[PDB]
Amino acid sequence: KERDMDELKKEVSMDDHKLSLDELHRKYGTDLSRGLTPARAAEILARDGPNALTPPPTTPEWVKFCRQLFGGFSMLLWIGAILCFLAYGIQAATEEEPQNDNLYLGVVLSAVVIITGCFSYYQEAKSSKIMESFKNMVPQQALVIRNGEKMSINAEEVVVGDLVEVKGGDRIPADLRIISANGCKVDNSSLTGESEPQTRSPDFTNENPLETRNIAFFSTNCVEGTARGIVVYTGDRTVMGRIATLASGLEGGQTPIAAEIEHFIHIITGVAVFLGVSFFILSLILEYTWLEAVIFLIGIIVANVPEGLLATVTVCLTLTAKRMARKNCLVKNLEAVETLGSTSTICSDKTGTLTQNRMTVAHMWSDNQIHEADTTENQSGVSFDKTSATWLALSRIAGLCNRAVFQANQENLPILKRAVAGDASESALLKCIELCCGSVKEMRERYTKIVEIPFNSTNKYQLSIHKNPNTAEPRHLLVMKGAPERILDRCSSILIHGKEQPLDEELKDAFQNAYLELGGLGERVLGFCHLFLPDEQFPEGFQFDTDDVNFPLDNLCFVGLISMIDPPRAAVPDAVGKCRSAGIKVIMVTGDHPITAKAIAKGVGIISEGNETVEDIAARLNIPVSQVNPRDAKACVVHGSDLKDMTSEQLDDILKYHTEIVFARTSPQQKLIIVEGCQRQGAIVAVTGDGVNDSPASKKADIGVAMGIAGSDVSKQAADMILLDDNFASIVTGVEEGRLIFDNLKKSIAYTLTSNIPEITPFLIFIIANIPLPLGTVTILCIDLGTDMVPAISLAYEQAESDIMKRQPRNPKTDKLVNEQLISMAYGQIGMIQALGGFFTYFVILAENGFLPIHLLGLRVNWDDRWINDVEDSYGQQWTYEQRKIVEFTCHTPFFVTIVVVQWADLVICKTRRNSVFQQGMKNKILIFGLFEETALAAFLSYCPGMGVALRMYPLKPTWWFCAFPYSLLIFVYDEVRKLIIRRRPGGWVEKETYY
Amino acid sequence: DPFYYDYETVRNGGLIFAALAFIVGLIIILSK
Amino acid sequence: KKFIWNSEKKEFLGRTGGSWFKILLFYVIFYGCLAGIFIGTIQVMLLTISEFKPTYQDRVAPPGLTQIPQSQKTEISFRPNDPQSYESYVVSIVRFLEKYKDLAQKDDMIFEDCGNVPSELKERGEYNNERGERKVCRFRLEWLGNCSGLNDETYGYKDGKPCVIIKLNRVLGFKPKPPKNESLETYPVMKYNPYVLPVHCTGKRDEDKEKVGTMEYFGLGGYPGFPLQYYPYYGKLLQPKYLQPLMAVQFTNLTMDTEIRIECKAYGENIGYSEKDRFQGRFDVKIEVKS
Ligand SMILES: C[C@H]1O[C@@H](O[C@H]2[C@@H](O)C[C@H](O[C@H]3[C@@H](O)C[C@H](O[C@H]4CC[C@@]5(C)[C@H](CC[C@@H]6[C@@H]5CC[C@]5(C)[C@@H](C7=CC(=O)OC7)CC[C@]65O)C4)O[C@@H]3C)O[C@@H]2C)C[C@H](O)[C@@H]1O
Ligand SMILES: *[C@@H]1O[C@H](CO)[C@@H](O[C@@H]2O[C@H](CO)[C@@H](O)[C@H](O)[C@H]2NC(C)=O)[C@H](O)[C@H]1NC(C)=O
Ligand SMILES: *[C@@H]1O[C@H](CO)[C@@H](O[C@@H]2O[C@H](CO)[C@@H](O)[C@H](O)[C@H]2NC(C)=O)[C@H](O)[C@H]1NC(C)=O
Ligand SMILES: CC(C)CCC[C@@H](C)[C@H]1CC[C@H]2[C@@H]3CC=C4C[C@@H](O)CC[C@]4(C)[C@H]3CC[C@]12C
Ligand SMILES: CC(C)CCC[C@@H](C)[C@H]1CC[C@H]2[C@@H]3CC=C4C[C@@H](O)CC[C@]4(C)[C@H]3CC[C@]12C
Ligand SMILES: *[C@@H]1O[C@H](CO)[C@@H](O)[C@H](O)[C@H]1NC(C)=O
Ligand SMILES: [Mg+2]
Ligand SMILES: [Mg+2]
Numbered sequence A: 001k002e003r004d005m006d007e008l009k010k011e012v013s014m015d016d017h018k019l020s021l022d023e024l025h026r027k028y029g030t031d032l033s034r035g036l037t038p039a040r041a042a043e044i045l046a047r048d049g050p051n052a053l054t055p056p057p058t059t060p061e062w063v064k065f066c067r068q069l070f071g072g073f074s075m076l077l078w079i080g081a082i083l084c085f086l087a088y089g090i091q092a093a094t095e096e097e098p099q100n101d102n103l104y105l106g107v108v109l110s111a112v113v114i115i116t117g118c119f120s121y122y123q124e125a126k127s128s129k130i131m132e133s134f135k136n137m138v139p140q141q142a143l144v145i146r147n148g149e150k151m152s153i154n155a156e157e158v159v160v161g162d163l164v165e166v167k168g169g170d171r172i173p174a175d176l177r178i179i180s181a182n183g184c185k186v187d188n189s190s191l192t193g194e195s196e197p198q199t200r201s202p203d204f205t206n207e208n209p210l211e212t213r214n215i216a217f218f219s220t221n222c223v224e225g226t227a228r229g230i231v232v233y234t235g236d237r238t239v240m241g242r243i244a245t246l247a248s249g250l251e252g253g254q255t256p257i258a259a260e261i262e263h264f265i266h267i268i269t270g271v272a273v274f275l276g277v278s279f280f281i282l283s284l285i286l287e288y289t290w291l292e293a294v295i296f297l298i299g300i301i302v303a304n305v306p307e308g309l310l311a312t313v314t315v316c317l318t319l320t321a322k323r324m325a326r327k328n329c330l331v332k333n334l335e336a337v338e339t340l341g342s343t344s345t346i347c348s349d350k351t352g353t354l355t356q357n358r359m360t361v362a363h364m365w366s367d368n369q370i371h372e373a374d375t376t377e378n379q380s381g382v383s384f385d386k387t388s389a390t391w392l393a394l395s396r397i398a399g400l401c402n403r404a405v406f407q408a409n410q411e412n413l414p415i416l417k418r419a420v421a422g423d424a425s426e427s428a429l430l431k432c433i434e435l436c437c438g439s440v441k442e443m444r445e446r447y448t449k450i451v452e453i454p455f456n457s458t459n460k461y462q463l464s465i466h467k468n469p470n471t472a473e474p475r476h477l478l479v480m481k482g483a484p485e486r487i488l489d490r491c492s493s494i495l496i497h498g499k500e501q502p503l504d505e506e507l508k509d510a511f512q513n514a515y516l517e518l519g520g521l522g523e524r525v526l527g528f529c530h531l532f533l534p535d536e537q538f539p540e541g542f543q544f545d546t547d548d549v550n551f552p553l554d555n556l557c558f559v560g561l562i563s564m565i566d567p568p569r570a571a572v573p574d575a576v577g578k579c580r581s582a583g584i585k586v587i588m589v590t591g592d593h594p595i596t597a598k599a600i601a602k603g604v605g606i607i608s609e610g611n612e613t614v615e616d617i618a619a620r621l622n623i624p625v626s627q628v629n630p631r632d633a634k635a636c637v638v639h640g641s642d643l644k645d646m647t648s649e650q651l652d653d654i655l656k657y658h659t660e661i662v663f664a665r666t667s668p669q670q671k672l673i674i675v676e677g678c679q680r681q682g683a684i685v686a687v688t689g690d691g692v693n694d695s696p697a698s699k700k701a702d703i704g705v706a707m708g709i710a711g712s713d714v715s716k717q718a719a720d721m722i723l724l725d726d727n728f729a730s731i732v733t734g735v736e737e738g739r740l741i742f743d744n745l746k747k748s749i750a751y752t753l754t755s756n757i758p759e760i761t762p763f764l765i766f767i768i769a770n771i772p773l774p775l776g777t778v779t780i781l782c783i784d785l786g787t788d789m790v791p792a793i794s795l796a797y798e799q800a801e802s803d804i805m806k807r808q809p810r811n812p813k814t815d816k817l818v819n820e821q822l823i824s825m826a827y828g829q830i831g832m833i834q835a836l837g838g839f840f841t842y843f844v845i846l847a848e849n850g851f852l853p854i855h856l857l858g859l860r861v862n863w864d865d866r867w868i869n870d871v872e873d874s875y876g877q878q879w880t881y882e883q884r885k886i887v888e889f890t891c892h893t894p895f896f897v898t899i900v901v902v903q904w905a906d907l908v909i910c911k912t913r914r915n916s917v918f919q920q921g922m923k924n925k926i927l928i929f930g931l932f933e934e935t936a937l938a939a940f941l942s943y944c945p946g947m948g949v950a951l952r953m954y955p956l957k958p959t960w961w962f963c964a965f966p967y968s969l970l971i972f973v974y975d976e977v978r979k980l981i982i983r984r985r986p987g988g989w990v991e992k993e994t995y996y
Numbered sequence B: 001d002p003f004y005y006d007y008e009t010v011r012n013g014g015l016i017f018a019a020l021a022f023i024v025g026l027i028i029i030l031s032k
Numbered sequence C: 001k002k003f004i005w006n007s008e009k010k011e012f013l014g015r016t017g018g019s020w021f022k023i024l025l026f027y028v029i030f031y032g033c034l035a036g037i038f039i040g041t042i043q044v045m046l047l048t049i050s051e052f053k054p055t056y057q058d059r060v061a062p063p064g065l066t067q068i069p070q071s072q073k074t075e076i077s078f079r080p081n082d083p084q085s086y087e088s089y090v091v092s093i094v095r096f097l098e099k100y101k102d103l104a105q106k107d108d109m110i111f112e113d114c115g116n117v118p119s120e121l122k123e124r125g126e127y128n129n130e131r132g133e134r135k136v137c138r139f140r141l142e143w144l145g146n147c148s149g150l151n152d153e154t155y156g157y158k159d160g161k162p163c164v165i166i167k168l169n170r171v172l173g174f175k176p177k178p179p180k181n182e183s184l185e186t187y188p189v190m191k192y193n194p195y196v197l198p199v200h201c202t203g204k205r206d207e208d209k210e211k212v213g214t215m216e217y218f219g220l221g222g223y224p225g226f227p228l229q230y231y232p233y234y235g236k237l238l239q240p241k242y243l244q245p246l247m248a249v250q251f252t253n254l255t256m257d258t259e260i261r262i263e264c265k266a267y268g269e270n271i272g273y274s275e276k277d278r279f280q281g282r283f284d285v286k287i288e289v290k291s
């Protein structure tokens, strides 16, 4: 019945917050100013569980070890091993003196799967280990009022229905129902996604508990002020608790790379069973009984299984993952590194992921001119002109009249990431003055504050009077700040380049239009003014006791406006542009206000400059929005209030007809709905988030991208990729590597798939022509698991033949990893030439030793026999058993060498899919060593003292090393001219049939 | 006799070549 | 998604008709060129070898020593009474010696009477074709006494005390060199050390050597070996219907109903041995005349 549980969790949350104080206290049975008695608290403590989310489901290490021994590729090698032991049992019990080939091969295949499992498991475990070193869970205590007394206890020791007080800086313990607040502003950024610090009022405001102000939430931190509240939800029942539990209980899906592996195996086994079955029937038609035919069937089918391709593909993915870890782009999954390259739609989170999630001074209005300060996360943008007296006055008003200061350890920290105490706005102002105005320490103590006036609840304004230490005027300096609509009512003078002017409407109206520019831009504006008090009417000894009119509220001198907003990260704009260049649909998904989300989207690249929304067209035409046609607007903003009242078809239409979509005010569950809707299109979706709301979206997506520091722990665990550096450009690096390794994998696969033809064809003609075995099993193992390992791995180091960040995302149903073109090239043409070269070397060796190639027909009947020591060759000679068998093994060895020789040119041609060998060039040093090591290793396997005794690999006469050279040259020439025609004729014959 | 092949010299040369090409490849991946 | 068989827009098994024809034609021409290339190179390879001599002859350095009853495991198990028990042996013996009858060697243009006494080697010029088809020295069945007879179509052989002739592996240009007169303990043999390749049989351990009581050898003129007048061999092309020397070995005093091992080792300087090939130089047999 877990289906019903997950379904009841996918629904949006509900509440009873909208209740009178008497009704809430009667429902919960709790005093309003004293809470409850401690015995009652302990009774609820041992009633439902401590206030802490139940730990995640522990994953034992033996479970995931066995997991890495299975899947799809490893499963194929497993059935191969099982078939080896099956054929071995049939050969053991049925015939005299059976051979131990199938048994050697069975144990070897089993070992391959086990070793690959150990390697892959060690990699995934390494990533999980460095991830465990990131849990910096600091036990935080809550301030609870019980029995009429305040006490700080463990957050787990908190229960339902009791008074809880929170101070500005304290994290909200559990979900509270605000009962009495005083200037309280909480941060709901990690949960609902609201950027600016949302205030919390005890009075019920919105039907939606997320938008209301009388509710404190789990994992939300009180920015400023103090507040009181009764605990309504506790533990997992909390909002973020149900969110985390939902994220853990969601499906992960099938990665595109794994699906491609499945398709590859389908074709491999398809042709394997076709050849095995048709040859089984052929063998029974010839003369072989059911026994021998079954053995041949298993041999042919298992031979068509790339034994070494598992490890090579795994190591390829591991190498790319290594590069991901070097750039602090960790992947918890070994194959999630590829998912970026297959992505075609990125559902990004705004606050925290796209933006820096921090209020920062954006623009200023000085001398009737707008000045854009540097808003990057590391200070690398343009700086304004800081040389005018207007800027000095404005910066002094900001640095002096503000309730923001640094702390004790804020020394060796940058001006941005350092900690500030007080309001978020005041923190932004303090950082801007500490950055573009020198420092604020000596700047604030130089003007000793006499009397201050903090911000008022109504008719907002913040002012203060300071002493002026200038060596020209001893008059007092009065400063004030506030909302522009509040400062325009308390001003008459205007500052311009140093001198004052009246409040002339010719420039005052310009001030209003500039205010509308900054406000309509999704920013919060604040006006700053100051005035010199007449020292003749207020001497240097008079104290301006704050009770009556001692400061001229009007006739002040306004200097300029100072706006602020959460800016996007540094490489975020460029990165977004890159993703749109690669052909990826960037969709913003957030629960923030639309007025800010639209501006941020225009600022990052999700909304192009020129495109208009469905509302923008009507606004431009001064007509109702119901008149315009949605097809005329390429972009659209979707409000969460309207998203709840939607069907699947409507969302499908929204996505299909609108290229730039901005989902705003979306609940966490609705974020999951957005991701599922994008997945219904059949495309690959990637979700980049940070808050707890992005946990289900990152879990259900094909790949979740979380921030290493600015992201909540829940969404960081439910994601598949972590950015320890929080650099969004890593997404771009990701989509580059995914496609890169994908294409390289194609190459690396084709290579190993090419050697299968010369590995099986000797046995096939051994069955047809009844000639001695041209290629033994041990030599085949020396090829698949010996020499070709380094060339196949070096093929993963291949670079981009063209700009991959220019092409569109691969289509899932069209661009498959392994298609008929790849098989037509490897199994059809190249592997064929390699097989012919092997047979050439075979016939050459046998004919030169006295067995003419024509004389070998039907000779296996007397060859495989161990007692016929007088087999007549072509020159009338009588060959004993071990003599001709020595020739057969000294024929298997150069056959293997021949395979290496053709693999030289095969590696070179597979290195370049479309470009030429001369275009790409042998710059891949790892590949060069692949050829050198492969060649030297083959030579060692043939000439080491005792190879013919241990591996039955007898030494070779030097002429055999040249028996395959023309075949390799021909392979290289044919594939080179093929690529040449692919270049000159990018039409269809040489491109749609061979280019794989 | 023409029925005797100096397999020892060929094997020796094969081993020398197998060592030279391998160490040269090691120098290849080490561009310094 | 696996019913891509056909459609009204022309597709068969996955692709159209015109595409199937284009691909089939390309593969036919491609594979035709590949086959022609393999055939041309294999022809060049055929032109690099001669017709009168194999290029490499080192893999047959130590000559073998085979027998007439090509047993399944070099074992001779039969019944001295049941004629069908030893039919598989006699059949192969008669088929082997069918080319040694006096009627088979009747043409004087291809056969040459070597002699009743083993003489020196007979070198008939070089291995080229400048000379005509060389002559082959005759070897009548009468040389193998007590194991040839003048029987009918079926060679009535020995039921009790069987016969097992040995044969030296025919090798082109091989000149047998018997051991020097300084024989390093070669198991009593005749003093005809210079013109015959000796072959001596024995048991294998203290048990087999005791069970096998007496052995009688038969050869050209009565010598246990191969005469040098029949060597060297000049290939099947220049010497067709060639008859290599034969030498019979009979085990008179055997312990019936007991499997005993016999090792017939051929001695000589140009005769090597091998611990891996029990047939190179030496020869093994497991006789068991169960009554
Ligand atoms: C009754 C009658 O019996 C008479 O004896 C006969 C009779 O029993 C029939 C008997 O046939 C055997 C023999 O040909 C050997 C033959 O090996 C082939 C299949 C079995 C082996 C083990 C082998 C090496 C190669 C090996 C296959 C088994 C399959 C392989 C592992 C396969 C691979 C799979 C892979 O993944 O990589 C390669 C390709 C080929 C392969 O490498 C090749 O398997 C056959 C089943 O031969 C005997 C000599 C005597 C007398 O006449 C008497 O009266
Ligand atoms: C071949 O077999 C015959 C038997 O058919 C052997 O002839 C016997 O020889 C012994 C001496 O060894 C005589 O005492 C017997 O009288 C002979 N019997 C007959 C019927 O002739 C003959 O010895 C055998 N030949 C060899 C070389 O062993
Ligand atoms: C042939 O072998 C037999 C043994 O099968 C020999 O005769 C035996 O001699 C021992 C004494 O050494 C006696 O104890 C046995 O009773 C004898 N058995 C038979 C059946 O006679 C015989 O001497 C051997 N003959 C030759 C010529 O080697
Ligand atoms: C039967 C076969 C071997 C003959 C085919 C001719 C081949 C071997 C010749 C024909 C044209 C030649 C190429 C012509 C073009 C290029 C680009 C140039 O900037 C460097 C030389 C290079 C890389 C040549 C290499 C050898 C080449 C491919
Ligand atoms: C196409 C070219 C550039 C590749 C360069 C590698 C070629 C030239 C090398 C690689 C392996 C080499 C062979 C290595 C082993 C043997 C055995 C040795 O005792 C004699 C030399 C001989 C017969 C070599 C001949 C040259 C050879 C084929
Ligand atoms: C070998 O030596 C013996 C005497 O020891 C002698 O009778 C015989 O003729 C010699 N044979 C040869 C070929 O020298
Ligand atoms: Mg293979
Ligand atoms: Mg966020």
Ligand code: NA
Pocket (backbone or CB within 6 Å): A251, A252, A253, A698, A699, A700, A701, A702, A703, A704, A719, A720
């Ligand atoms: Na996932």
